[PDB]
């Protein structure tokens, strides 16, 4: 739908939509920018991620409200409306996964871009897994696991332990272990090892990099406090 707008204009409008908290618009603008076919910069990758995380985040929050109402009840209306929200959520995840597969991931050769996109792929398969109940649920879970695992392997080889994308990836893979894979011990071990190895690398950082890394380390600490 954005095919007639300039790439630079789509990016500019994505930033405006973020300021206006219009995340559906922001996601559509960034989808249009990706579909121009050029690789994305660090800043542009962040705009893409922020837009879709906010869209799906609102859908996930609504799905959880409705799923809770449905469970307490168990006419067709609650189930029907939960299904409607679920289908919309699945469509957004499918859209993002399609952008990553056509063709963001295959063109991503640098560690920072490839890990960023593979973490996204793991995240959106995780969101699909949160609502999955049918015969493909196990395959959805393994698709999330596989994407996270490839991202982990690259990040451990190519990035310092304090790198924010490496930290965020480990955080989210640990949430996957805890909430999706029913592996809370793996979740806790990954969070602890990630935190400890980041702590030992902080001495290498500037004040601004220190701030970036310790922010995400605190989220690891918050989860360990919740889980232990």
């Amino acid at each position: 739908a954005m095919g007639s707008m300039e790439r630079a204009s789509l990016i500019q409008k994505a930033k405006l939509a973020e300021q206006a908290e219009r995340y559906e618009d922001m996601a559509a603008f960034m989808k249009g920018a990706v579909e121009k076919g050029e690789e994305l910069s660090c800043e542009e990758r962040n705009l893409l991620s922020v837009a879709y995380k906010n869209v799906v985040g609102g859908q996930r929050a609504a799905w959880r409200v409705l799923s809770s109402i449905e469970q307490k009840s168990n006419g067709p209306e609650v189930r029907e409306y939960r299904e409607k929200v679920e289908t919309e959520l699945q469509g957004v995840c499918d859209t993002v996964l399609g952008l990553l597969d056509s063709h963001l991931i295959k063109e991503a050769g640098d560690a920072e871009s490839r890990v960023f996109y593979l973490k996204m792929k793991g995240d959106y398969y995780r969101y699909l897994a949160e609502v999955a109940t049918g015969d493909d649920k196990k395959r959805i879970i393994d698709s999330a696991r596989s994407a996270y695992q490839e991202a982990m392997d690259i990040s451990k080889k190519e990035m310092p332990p304090t790198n924010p994308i490496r930290l965020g990836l480990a955080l989210n893979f640990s949430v996957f272990h805890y909430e999706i894979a029913n592996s809370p011990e793996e979740a806790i071990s990954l969070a602890k090892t990630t935190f400890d190895e980041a702590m030992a690398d902080l001495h290498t950082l500037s004040e601004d990099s220190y701030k970036d890394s310790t922010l995400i380390m605190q989220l690891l600490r918050d989860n360990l406090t919740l889980w232990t």
């Binding site: 995240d123 965020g168 989210n172 949430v175 995400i216």
Partner: peptide
Amino acid sequence: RPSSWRQ
């Protein structure tokens, strides 16, 4: 319930 990455 747990925290995944956020801005």
